[PDB]
Design an enzyme around this catalytic site. Structure first.
Site, PDB file in Angstrom:
ATOM      1  N   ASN A 114     -10.870 -41.997 -28.981  1.00 32.57           N
ATOM      2  CA  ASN A 114     -10.896 -40.613 -29.451  1.00 32.57           C
ATOM      3  C   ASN A 114     -11.110 -39.667 -28.263  1.00 32.57           C
ATOM      4  OD1 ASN A 114     -11.330 -38.508 -31.745  1.00 32.57           O
ATOM      5  ND2 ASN A 114     -13.182 -38.339 -30.499  1.00 32.57           N
ATOM      6  N   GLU A 115     -10.134 -38.790 -28.009  1.00 34.53           N
ATOM      7  CA  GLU A 115     -10.200 -37.771 -26.952  1.00 34.53           C
ATOM      8  C   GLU A 115     -10.579 -38.371 -25.608  1.00 34.53           C
ATOM      9  OE1 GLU A 115     -12.683 -34.462 -28.279  1.00 34.53           O
ATOM     10  OE2 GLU A 115     -11.195 -34.016 -29.846  1.00 34.53           O
ATOM     11  N   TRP A 143     -12.609 -32.350 -40.272  1.00 31.37           N
ATOM     12  CA  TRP A 143     -13.770 -32.618 -39.448  1.00 31.37           C
ATOM     13  C   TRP A 143     -14.837 -31.567 -39.751  1.00 31.37           C
ATOM     14  CZ3 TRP A 143     -14.961 -36.753 -36.854  1.00 31.37           C
ATOM     15  CH2 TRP A 143     -16.120 -36.718 -36.071  1.00 31.37           C
TER      16      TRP A 143
END
Ligand SMILES: [Ca+2]
Ligand SMILES: [Ca+2]
Ligand code: NA
Ligand code: NA
Lengths: 838, 840
Positions: free
Chosen positions: A394-395, A542
């Site tokens: 993630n990222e 989110w």
């Protein structure tokens, strides 16, 4: 036979390292009594610098006599970030990773005559275990169930990567038929060989027997036997969707062949579905176009952290399901078995990932631990039909691009990153050929330029246009360009959201005012783009909850406040926007004022004060009443309608109604309203506490004092307000107040503040915080008299720290004119409050 | 002129002892940065053993150049329990008492050329300062405003027992006229004699000037000059009541006689009222019968303790006023100036007392400090016309009679106690001839027998019949007996109330189940007795708020939960019972289900589940609807009606309607409902979590998990329930759970628990807590359908007494029932809760 039960009770706990703590004869009487699940990091809900280090746990194990001849398997469902297990002083094993289970056969270390000592050394400081960076708290401790399972000497393998040891999958699925493969391992822990019969019984959703598979097996002493049995193809299989969660129970049983006596047994569900992702046309479930209506869910709850009991996991699930969600991104780490059980049985498609976030560091052993965590996740959750996709990053460029700017600096880091990503993709596909791989990116094309976006089957974009800068319309634009440039990469919007704070409301909502209304504006823009764009497979909001992230300041320090529900799982009003959009099977009609129950406003004379009241609904038209008076009917658009409501009485009753599928639908609630005079005089000053959120266009209602601080307004003759200056804002945490957001906004280069008021004695409260870390110093005068000769908030208190100063002032004029006199830096004011005393 | 401002900002704090902490050059850069008000005892909201000891505060003072020729007065409005003040290392003075102000002329200690250090050593461990016993937390710290006041060398005396130095009273008041006495002291701190003019200006309530009095006075350098000036009698005074809080401003001004320059100025309110307490006919205000409709208010708020800002005091007051209260018992200690301002101006009569509670200790200096605190309270709060009575003892025999059972041990303690009571009664009346003296008693005739009830002007009875034992009717019996035997002692019911817990609801409420409904039954009984009995002057409900008392366990440890409102000041539904009874000027229509928004109950087939829904209202008739369906109209009695409501849907909308003073009145809200099947089958086990509060007749809804645990029910064929045993209850705190009341109730000597349920795999969770510490010790086996799941479980041996155990078991049911059986080995078998789910 098998017996499984928890040993969550009767523990002692010590924070920190400790000599001889694993020993049987250790005196732990002065340790803290605790019950699992447990975290030692409830401090993270107030302190940014939460404790990362070692904690010890001790429990006595006194075994039944009935277990004397059985194998005893210890399972820790989770311990953050790593754990070392001791039985009677002896190191049994260890586990690295805070979100996956571990298990150990502990039989050899145990006595059945004397009491045993289980000691666990847990550590959440370790930099070689993911996550080492990410926007959440790395809670320490044993915060999921701990089990003992007693089984006979021949039993299913319970020590394969902390899993059940059985793996069931459906190699082919269609409407006409599906195939079913049932695999696993049997262990013979007896000193003598054994002859066994293995049976798989498969049941239809209605519970009737579909099929029985039998197979004899022989195992030498100490042997592990691997089986793989195919069933008769299932004809016209009942297909699984979140709406129709049809499950086939598979019961796997082990018997002594001669005596036929039952030895071990293990139940699982399987299900029949197929799915695919198309770059142009989106997600398909069982051949049909299907929009993924998703949310992300973190696993903590203020103030107990991740130490949730399983009814709390089921509570969370039920709220998400009742909202109309059909997809969950279980992130950034794998989560409780209790959650996945509900996804299977009540119905929610799922994405699950391990927490490799922000940057791949050059940390020895980090890669090896990630690989192991990926195997552990996939093997432990293999049999959840709800899960369609595994992720592992993630990222992963977010911090990398912040820390390394030059192509020279980036090269080793990008090499390391691409290598670990390709390695895990291979592991993923070795472990599981039946599911799709995914990765989540932050909103940068560097994920395309670096090659990261070629690696997985589908890609997720974490997008925040209209929140972290940019415009709301930049969202659909970003996606449109991705689709133009990379049309064969199917997309999910794997994050989107905006922060909100119940205390803050605005008639002119703006990003980072943290008003309830701006998050609504943001989500009301995003959801239709997700729904109406065919090449968007879906989105995962989110986050479902306001969650713990100790490093955050902003309006609610220590909390990421982008939830659809508050940390205590009370829904925000905007939860019902989603529910209106996603549930057609029921009427939805929600007056969106549960977040705004304490209203105030400036009143001209005795005329009503108008404030908006929003409604979320799937009705086509709604009527709103206030204290029995109709405000008219309005046609709904995008599941919403807003009324301009005339407030006057102090405790109004709001009521809405309309018609849905032939039936009348109603909602209602009382709220509180407080009028504040536009023009002060002797009568309307009695009982008045005139409070102003200087430098802000938000109403701020303290959740500690219940007082509402009004939006700032310029002085006009007869009234009150500011003179000069410009709005200023900070997101750093303000010390020494519960009312952070009041001090985080200010009027900078302020010249004056004036109230037209009668002669008398007044209490004036001035609120300061210097947010500009020469140093600002300034005088204050009121009606010509100096009240501060030389005030420097930063010299007195430091930066980002509240100062509240009260003054008694005698007014012998028809106004109270407060003037600021700069001698260094700028004059600023963060809040002001006026009361008449005499 | 006079300049008054706070110095609440920019402090450093250190808990514990610290040598040299007073020194100007001391390095406090690693101390904690705090802003007053402050307490160091937020620990009391979790820990019983809260810290009592020393705490140090340090601030820099940089004085305005404009103050060079002025006197500088420091006032600490409160520091619990004592403070020693240092300026630049020099001891300036000290104060004993945690609820009264102190003030000091600090001019001699300060420099105007250099920065100054203010250090305060605060102590909340001292045993020679009241209270040393009482049902509340003795919070430490500087938890009210701290002020600097700068005045000219001639000014009003600001160092007379921490007061404003002026004292205004009305020696005679009638409808026809009133007299007005304006008294105080002027100080001349200059080296030269001063010749001054004193002016009093008196304003009517509407702000027009009534009279100006002017007097020449002369003070020798250093003199304290006492003045006492009578106004012209006020003709046809506008009278003060809570309903009509008419105030006359008195502005007092000091000017230099030659220059006429303004020197000091002080404003106060006065007001005109008279009052009387009668043993037969109750209380009279301005010649008219008047029922005191009272509340008691403690001053803390979870989790900030007493460190309230003044808008929080005003919030509390507005809530009490909106309920229709006209009387406040400010107890057990005097409270913020912010509160008393509102009592004067928005209108509420007041009783204020100092905290001499439970037992008079044999501690040197204790009596002297009590006397000083009484004088401080009266002088500081002298000018609040809302205050009509002063008190100084509460339940002063309670611990005495518990501790000492022999006449030899009792005699000196009673002697000591009567001595102090008589001493303080004298002090009270020396200090204030204009107000009534009061004392509060626990519910025992010993206060009459010892002679304590013959000391004060009126008496207060703290009464809890129907809570702490006895029937509810014992309340009016006790009072009738007092009135019979002591007819000339006018009575206030100075405390009454019952605990409640939002998490607990009962269809059969009883004392100490802590249900919302029992507190309602208790208060619905008490309030009409208070309203309707002539010789009861009135009552003060105990307490307005759920408040901090660290020594308490019961259903909400650390909290006394007898509030009408929750600690966060959200009203309980029963707040609106009072509101309905006490407000005639507004409609009150309150669906009393805000305390019960998460409902569950056992359902037969698909038939509705009936649960009561109460309404509190001053309407004569009300109609309740559920999801648009009328449940009919009911006539209200005692401001209430209850409907039996058919619940079925998950998110019902309740709506109530009626007419008041010719207009339609409405209320409504949504709540949550969860049906639980009486008869388990494969269909209705899907998604079911069947949770039961074993041993209780209460629904328990966890405020942590939001799950409701049902009242226990006996096993019946086709259903589920317990077999054998009897209910047991504890009030001790349970360790290792947020859900204490679930574990505080159990079924003792339980034999089994059975669920008729289809074959399958089930998760069974068993909840245990051993509450019989006086145990021999309980050990038992447990089997499920003949399978042993515990061969020797002993909660108290494994976890100890009063500690939660929650054990989950996976079992495979190959029968048509799940039959859990308990097998005694030692002591008794018990079960506190049980929860079932089907897994396969
Ligand atoms: Ca679990
Ligand atoms: Ca104050
Ligand atoms: Na502000
Ligand atoms: Na119980």
């Amino acid at each position: 036979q098998r017996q499984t039960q928890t040993i969550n009770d009767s523990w002692k706990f010590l924070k920190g390292e400790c000599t001889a703590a694993a020993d049987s004869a250790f005196d732990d009487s002065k340790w803290t009594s605790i019950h699992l699940p447990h975290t030692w990091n409830t401090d993270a809900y107030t302190e940014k610098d939460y404790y990362r280090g070692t904690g010890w746990y001790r429990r006595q194990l006194t075994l039944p006599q009935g277990w004397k001849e059985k194998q005893i398997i210890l399972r820790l469902d989770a311990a953050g970030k790593s754990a070392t297990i001791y039985i009677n002083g002896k190191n049994v094993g260890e586990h690295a990773g805070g979100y996956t289970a571990c298990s150990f056969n502990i039989t050899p270390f145990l006595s059945f005559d004397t009491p045993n000592t289980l000691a666990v050394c847990v550590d959440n400081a370790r930099q070689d275990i993911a996550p080492i960076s990410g926007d959440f708290t790395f809670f320490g401790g044993i915060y999921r169930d701990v089990w003992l399972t007693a089984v006979p000497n021949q039993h299913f393998n319970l020590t394969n990567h902390g899993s059940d040891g059985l793996f069931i999958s459906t190699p082919q699925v269609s409407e006409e038929q599906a195939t079913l493969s049932i695999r696993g391992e049997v262990k013979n822990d007896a000193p003598e060989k054994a002859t066994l019969e293995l049976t798989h019984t498969i049941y239809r959703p209605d519970g009737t027997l579909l099929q029985t598979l039998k197979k004899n097996i022989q195992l030498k002493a100490g042997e592990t036997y691997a089986f793989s049995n195919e069933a008769t193809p299932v004809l016209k299989p009942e297909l699984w969707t979140p709406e129709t969660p049809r499950l086939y129970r598979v019961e796997t049983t082990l018997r002594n062949r001669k005596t036929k006596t039952l030895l071990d047994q293990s139940n699982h569900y399987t299900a029949f579905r197929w799915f695919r992702f198309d770059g142009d046309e989106g997600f398909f479930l069982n051949g049909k176009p299907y929009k993924l209506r998703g949310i992300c869910r973190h696993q903590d709850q203020k103030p107990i952290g991740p130490a949730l009991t399983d009814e709390m996991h089921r509570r969370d699930f039920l709220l998400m399901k009742e909202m109309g969600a059909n997809f969950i991104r279980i992130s950034h780490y794998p989560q409780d078995d209790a959650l996945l059980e509900m996804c299977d049985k009540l119905g929610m498609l799922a994405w699950e990932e391990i927490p490799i976030i922000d940057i791949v560091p050059n940390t020895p052993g980090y890669g090896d631990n990630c690989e192991r965590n990926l195997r552990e996740m996939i093997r432990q959750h293999y049999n959840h039909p709800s899960i369609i996709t595994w992720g592992y990053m993630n990222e992963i460029l977010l911090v990398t691009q912040r820390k390394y700017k030059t192509e020279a600096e980036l090269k080793p880091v990008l090499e390391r990153t691409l290598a670990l990503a390709n390695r895990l993709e291979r592991v993923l596909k070795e472990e599981d050929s039946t599911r799709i791989s995914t990765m989540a990116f932050h909103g940068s094309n560097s994920y395309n330029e670096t090659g990261l976006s070629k690696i997985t089957d589908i890609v997720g974009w974490n997008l925040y246009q209209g929140w972290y800068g940019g415009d709301l319309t930049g969202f659909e634009k970003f996606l449109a360009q991705q689709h133009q440039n990379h049309p064969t990469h199917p997309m999910i919007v794997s994050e989107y959201g905006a922060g909100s704070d119940k205390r803050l409301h605005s008639l002119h909502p703006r990003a980072f005012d943290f008003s309830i209304e701006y998050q609504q504006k943001y989500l009301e823009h995003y959801l239709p783009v997700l729904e109406d764009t065919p090449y968007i497979c879906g989105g995962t909001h989110w986050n479902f909850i306001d969650f713990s992230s100790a490093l955050r300041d902003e309006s609610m320090p220590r909390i990421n406040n982008k939830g659809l529900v508050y940390a205590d799982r009370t829904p925000k009003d905007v939860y019902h926007y989603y529910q209106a959009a996603w549930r057609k099977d029921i009427p939805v009609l929600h007056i969106a004022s549960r977040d705004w129950t304490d209203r105030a406003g400036v009143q001209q004379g005795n005329a009503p004060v108008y404030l908006p009241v929003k409604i979320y609904t799937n009705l086509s038209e709604v009527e709103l009443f206030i204290d029995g008076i109709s405000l008219g009917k309005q046609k709904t658009e995008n599941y919403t309608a807003t009324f301009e409501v005339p407030f006057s009485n102090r405790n109004p009753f709001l009521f809405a109604q309309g018609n849905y599928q032939g039936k009348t639908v109603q909602d209602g609630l009382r709220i509180n309203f407080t009028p504040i005079p536009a023009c002060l005089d002797a009568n309307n000053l009695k009982g008045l506490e005139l409070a102003v959120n200087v430098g802000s266009q938000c109403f701020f209602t303290s959740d500690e004092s219940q007082l509402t601080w009004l939006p700032d307004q310029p002085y006009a003759a007869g009234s009150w307000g500011y003179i000069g200056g410009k709005e200023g804002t900070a997101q750093t945490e303000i010390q020494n107040t519960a009312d952070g957001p009041l001090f985080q906004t200010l009027r900078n280069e302020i010249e004056g503040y004036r109230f037209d008021a009668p002669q008398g004695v007044y209490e004036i409260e001035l609120l300061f915080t210097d947010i500009f870390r020469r140093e600002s110093t300034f005088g204050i005068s009121i009606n010509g008299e100096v009240v501060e000769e030389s005030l420097s908030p930063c010299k007195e208190s430091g930066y980002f720290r509240a100062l509240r100063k009260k003054y008694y002032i005698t007014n012998d004029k028809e106004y109270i004119d407060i003037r600021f006199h700069s001698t260094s830096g700028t004059c600023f004011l963060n809040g002001i409050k006026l009361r008449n005393i005499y």
